Design a protein around this ligand. Structure first.
Ligand code: V14
Ligand code: ZN
Length: 257
């Protein structure tokens, strides 16, 4: 099955998931000088005041923090979006080394990691239907650089040993994802895809300009995760990122001058 190894990684995915070679794949390099400022782009609206986090799960690829998305509790609107997008889960991508790990790149710069908050469009009723639509999902992407700790990230870091292996989960209530967000909501946006199988071309990407800083100790905890389940040799969950894909016939827009 697919993964992030040389034997199962991104260069192989197209065999099971042929849209891997499609017209609107993600991630992409963001050329900041080419991206056009779009004065018609609205402030984004991140309303996470009622988020009910519920559970954290090591899914074997990343780990994911889950929210009750059975009502409008944690929603993304505005920006490039039409309508209301409910927060489903977050997860991260990161490297073995601080010089890699992000999926998007900015002028070819890789960040140490990238946080993705996955939301689905309420006019489609559930995430599986949303996956079938060009405007089904909105993923908010945030770069991580290594420097000072992110205090809001600390609750998340302190449970990973409890979900060390694939398929392990833990309760994870009362987490405020607001603590993962930079001062600024200035962003780039473009139409793209999931960055893991099934690679569905259903995502409006919103990538924030401002990274967050996390400490070396925080990102070291991510790198002690395992892709394996317990009993199988230990395989450090690192380098779980898809590289940049062809931009093709797309324009990346900036919300900021
Ligand atoms: N980067 S991304 O936002 O396109 C992405 C992932 F990289 C990712 F790892 C996941 S995951 O944590 O759930 C592991 C997926 O194998 C999702 N999650 C969504 C996409 C997967 C299809 C199911 C629809 C909702 C979850 C996912 F959306
Ligand atoms: Zn992701």
């Amino acid at each position: 099955h697919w993964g992030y190894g040389k034997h199962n990684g991104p260069e192989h995915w197209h065999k099971d998931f042929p849209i891997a070679k499609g017209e609107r794949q993600s991630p992409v390099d963001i050329d900041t000088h080419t991206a056009k400022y779009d004065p018609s782009l609205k402030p984004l609206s991140v309303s996470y005041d009622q988020a009910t986090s519920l559970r954290i799960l090591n899914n074997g690829h990343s780990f994911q923090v889950e929210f009750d998305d059975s009502q409008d509790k944690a929603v993304l609107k505005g920006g490039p979006l039409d309508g209301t997008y409910r927060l489903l889960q977050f997860h991260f991508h990161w490297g073995s080394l601080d010089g890699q790990g992000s999926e998007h790149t900015v002028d070819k710069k890789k960040y140490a990691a990238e946080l993705h908050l996955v939301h689905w469009n309420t006019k489609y009723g559930d995430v599986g239907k949303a996956l079938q639509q060009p405007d089904g999902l909105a993923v908010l992407g945030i770069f991580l650089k290594v420097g000072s700790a992110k205090p809001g990230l600390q609750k998340v870091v302190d449970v990973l040993d409890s979900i060390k292996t694939k398929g392990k989960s833990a309760d994870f209530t009362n987490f405020d994802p607001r603590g993962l967000l930079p001062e600024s909501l200035d962003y780039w946006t473009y139409p793209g895809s999931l960055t893991t199988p099934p690679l569905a071309e259903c995502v409006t990407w919103i990538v924030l300009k401002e990274p967050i800083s996390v400490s070396s100790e925080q990102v070291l905890k991510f790198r002690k995760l395992n892709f394996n389940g317990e009993g199988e040799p230990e395989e450090l969950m690192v380098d779980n990122w898809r590289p940049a894909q062809p931009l093709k016939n797309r324009q990346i827009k900036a919300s900021f001058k």
